[PDB]
């Protein structure tokens, strides 16, 4: 020992002298002259018992090297080996199997590649085995089954392949088995279900296939079970209801089928249940209401049918409830939202009908609520008017009705609402002014009338406004310049009137501008030339007037323009060359007059043009769009002559 | 899904002091209620326009798993790096706007896989290479413009590059004509 520490330390210095870049980490520099036991007292990461090495701890110390000159033949008393968080490279030598008293064996994050040598099976006294975060490949040897005293296996995030060995059935003292983020394959051995001490088993993110072994009914003390993102199949065995100590079962993103077994109601301690993205079918078992400690429940994206049971009224602690993207139908029970502390409710893309219950926000803590694409009807409840915690709300595609100014209230922390395709009527209120951090407001295709309150412009965090296909009236003020964060403004299909406000020119983030099918009647703002991001603008079907302003041709990023069904006049200018991105031009049904400029022989992006039913004359330009324009874009005009190949009802040009 | 995860990877690789990617939430099912991103009629992204928004950083290779994206706009920003090769996997793409940046490296040759492309704007950068000449294999190619970065060596005149003008490739150290 003390005399043998001579050879031990000499080998240790010889190994150390093989590293590279040791200068930065002067921590390992404390290895100095081997003498009468001074190194035990002064050498870092080393401990001796009775004068011989016992532990090698070198965490996070910046070492660089390999395991070529490791003294396998000089260290018969090494018992603890931890070399995590370094840059050791190479392979794992079989000689590692010759340490007779090794207990803790860690070779975590490193450069290690290659196989896993079978001879590690000789480690009769090994207790914890970590080979995490490496590039190991090959398979897992069956000789692992000879380690009858190991209690923790961690080999995840390597490049393993092949099947799970069946000899794992004899690892009779396992507790934690982590095999996630590897490329395993095959089927789960049934003997895995006969382990009397598992408490954590992770097989997620693999290519396991086949069916879950029903012997999983024998795992009487497992507290966690992850298998998501695999290729399982078959049906969830009913014996899965005897894992009576579970609190987190997740099996999402698989290829399972059949019905959900009712026996899941027998697990009192279950708190999380993930089963989305599968092919389950049938009806919800009422017994799913007998899980009194249930917090999260996600059964989205499946093929379930039938009614939602009333027994969900007994789930007092629910916080998340995901039922979206299914084929459930019928009415909605009052017990679905009974719980006080519910916070998310996701019920869209189903076939529900009827009225919303009167317990929607009973506890006053709801935050997220989606109901898209159902057949709900009637008025919104009144407990949802005074629910003061909403963040994201979606009502799109339904048949709610009532007064818009009476249906809602004030929401300090709302930032997204979508109420399109419904049957609300009334006038907008000024309560929306008090949602200061609101970002989107979509209210399209309803029966709303009235005028837009000035308070609607107090909002400066707004970024998308959509009040389209309604019966709004009035005129747009100048304080419209105040929003200035908006990038998508849709106000078409209404009865707005007056001038186009010049304040729009102060908007700079504007991308999408839809101002059509209204009764605006005044000159286009001659100062619209400071929109360096706009790519779409539709001002069709209006009562506009005197000649198009050339400032519109400094809209550099324009791609679609529609000045159609108006009372425009004059001549089209030659500044349209500057539009180097435009590819759609609807310019018909006006009094545009004169000749179409020839300089249009320069924009190669044009594909569709329409100048029909105007007062134009003269030859068409030499562009592919005019080359390939059907007859339906040239009628009604005076003297448009054309070429023989591009003959579409037009008189041959002289 | 997958488009959402690719766009989230793009978000993580950039820096934005103006907070223009604030709404890009990786928690939703689909990236169709995000701003500056437009989806198709059946939940598939078709435009990603983010130009003149003062972004700084590096592109990533995940941009290539947006199978149905038609428009890509990133011009007039402060991105540095090289153009990935996986951009050749965007089989249905019409326009590529990538100018007024600090891109480096060579132009990938895989850009010849894109048959429906109509607009290339890479100009005013620092790119160095040989104009791989596979671009003459797309044949749609209405306009191309790269005219401030050194691409020394040749201007191909295969069937495609026969209608262009010297105003492109200007100030680029080419001079084969």
């Amino acid at each position: 020992a003390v005399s043998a520490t001579v050879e031990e330390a000499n080998a240790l210095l010889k190994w150390k002298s093989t590293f590279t870049n040791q200068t930065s980490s002067s921590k390992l520099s404390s290895w100095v002259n081997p003498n009468t036991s001074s190194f035990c007292t002064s050498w870092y990461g080393v401990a001796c018992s009775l004068g011989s090495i016992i532990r090698l701890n070198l965490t996070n110390t910046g070492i660089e090297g390999t395991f070529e000159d490791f003294p396998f033949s000089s260290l018969p008393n090494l018992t603890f080996v931890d070399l995590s968080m370094n840059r050791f490279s190479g392979t794992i030598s079989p000689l590692w199997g010759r340490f007779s008293k090794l207990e803790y064996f860690d070779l975590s994050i490193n450069q290690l590649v290659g196989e896993i040598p079978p001879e590690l099976g000789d480690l009769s006294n090994l207790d914890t085995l970590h080979l995490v975060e490496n590039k190991l490949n090959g398979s897992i040897p069956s000789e692992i089954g000879r380690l009858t005293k190991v209690t923790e296996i961690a080999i995840y995030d390597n490049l393993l392949t092949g099947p799970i060995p069946s000899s794992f059935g004899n690892l009779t003292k396992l507790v934690n088995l982590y095999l996630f983020i590897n490329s395993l394959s095959g089927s789960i051995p049934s003997e895995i279900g006969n382990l009397p001490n598992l408490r954590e088993l992770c097989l997620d993110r693999n290519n396991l296939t086949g069916k879950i072994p029903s012997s999983f009914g024998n795992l009487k003390n497992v507290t966690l079970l992850n298998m998501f993102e695999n290729q399982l199949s078959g049906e969830i065995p009913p014996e899965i209801g005897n894992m009576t100590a579970l609190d987190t079962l997740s099996l999402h993103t698989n290829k399972l089928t059949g019905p959900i077994p009712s026996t899941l109601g027998n697990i009192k301690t279950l708190a999380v249940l993930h089963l989305y993205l599968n092919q389950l079918n049938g009806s919800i078992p009422p017994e799913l209401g007998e899980m009194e400690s249930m917090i999260d429940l996600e059964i989205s994206e499946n093929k379930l049918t039938g009614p939602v049971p009333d027994s969900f009224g007994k789930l007092t602690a629910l916080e998340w409830l995901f039922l979206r993207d299914n084929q459930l139908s019928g009415p909605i029970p009052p017990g679905i939202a009974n719980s006080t502390e519910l916070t998310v409710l996701q019920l869209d893309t189903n076939n529900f009908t009827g009225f919303l219950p009167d317990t929607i926000c009973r506890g006053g803590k709801l935050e997220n609520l989606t109901l898209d694409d159902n057949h709900f009807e009637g008025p919104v409840p009144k407990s949802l008017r005074d629910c003061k915690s909403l963040i994201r709300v979606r009502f799109k595609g339904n048949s709610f009705s009532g007064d818009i100014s009476e249906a809602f209230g004030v929401y300090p922390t709302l930032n997204f609402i979508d109420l399109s395709n419904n049957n609300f009527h009334g006038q907008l209120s000024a309560n929306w002014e008090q949602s200061q951090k609101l970002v989107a407001f979509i209210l399209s295709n309803n029966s709303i009338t009235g005028a837009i309150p000035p308070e609607i412009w107090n909002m400066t965090q707004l970024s998308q406004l959509d009040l389209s296909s309604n019966r709004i009236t009035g005129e747009l003020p100048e304080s419209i310049s105040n929003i200035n964060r908006i990038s998508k403004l849709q106000l078409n299909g209404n009865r707005l009137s007056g001038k186009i406000p010049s304040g729009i020119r102060l908007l700079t983030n504007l991308e999408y501008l839809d101002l059509s099918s209204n009764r605006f009647s005044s000159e286009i703002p001659p100062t619209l030339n400071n929109l360096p991001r706009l790519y779409y603008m539709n001002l069709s079907r209006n009562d506009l007037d005197q000649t198009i302003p050339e400032g519109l041709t400094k809209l550099s990023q324009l791609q679609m323009l529609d000045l159609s069904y108006n009372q425009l006049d004059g001549e089209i200018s030659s500044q349209f060359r500057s539009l180097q991105n435009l590819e759609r031009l609807d310019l018909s049904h006006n009094n545009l007059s004169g000749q179409i400029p020839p300089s249009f022989k320069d924009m190669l992006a044009l594909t569709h043009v329409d100048v029909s039913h105007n007062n134009l004359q003269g030859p068409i330009p030499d562009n592919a769009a005019f080359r390939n324009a059907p007859p339906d874009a040239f009628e009604g005009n005076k003297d448009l002559c054309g070429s023989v190949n591009t003959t579409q009802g037009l008189k041959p040009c002289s | 899904n997958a488009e959402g995860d690719a766009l989230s990877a793009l978000k993580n690789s950039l820096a934005d002091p103006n907070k223009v990617l604030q709404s890009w939430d990786a928690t939703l099912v689909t990236p169709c209620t995000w701003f500056h991103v437009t989806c198709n009629s059946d939940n598939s992204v078709t435009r990603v326009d983010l130009g003149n928004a003062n972004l700084s950083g590096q592109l990533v290779m995940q941009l290539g798993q947006l199978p149905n994206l038609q428009y890509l706009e990133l011009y007039s920003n402060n991105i540095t790096g090289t153009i990935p090769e996986q951009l050749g996997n965007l089989t249905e793409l019409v326009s590529l706007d990538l100018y007024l940046n600090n891109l480096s490296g060579p132009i990938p040759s895989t850009l010849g896989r894109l048959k429906k492309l109509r607009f290339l704007r890479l100009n005013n950068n620092s790119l160095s290479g040989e104009i791989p000449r596979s671009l003459t294999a797309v044949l749609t190619l209405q306009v191309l413009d790269l005219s401030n970065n050194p691409l020394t060596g040749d201007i191909p005149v295969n069937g495609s590059f026969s209608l262009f003008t010297p105003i492109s490739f200007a100030n680029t150290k080419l001079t084969p004509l």
Binding site: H130, N226, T248, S250 | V29, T30
Partner: peptide, 13 residues
């Protein structure tokens, strides 16, 4: 350190 896996949540709309 070595840890258990963690399951994410289903996407919302």
């Amino acid at each position: 350190p070595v840890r258990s896996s963690q399951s994410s949540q289903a996407g919302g709309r």
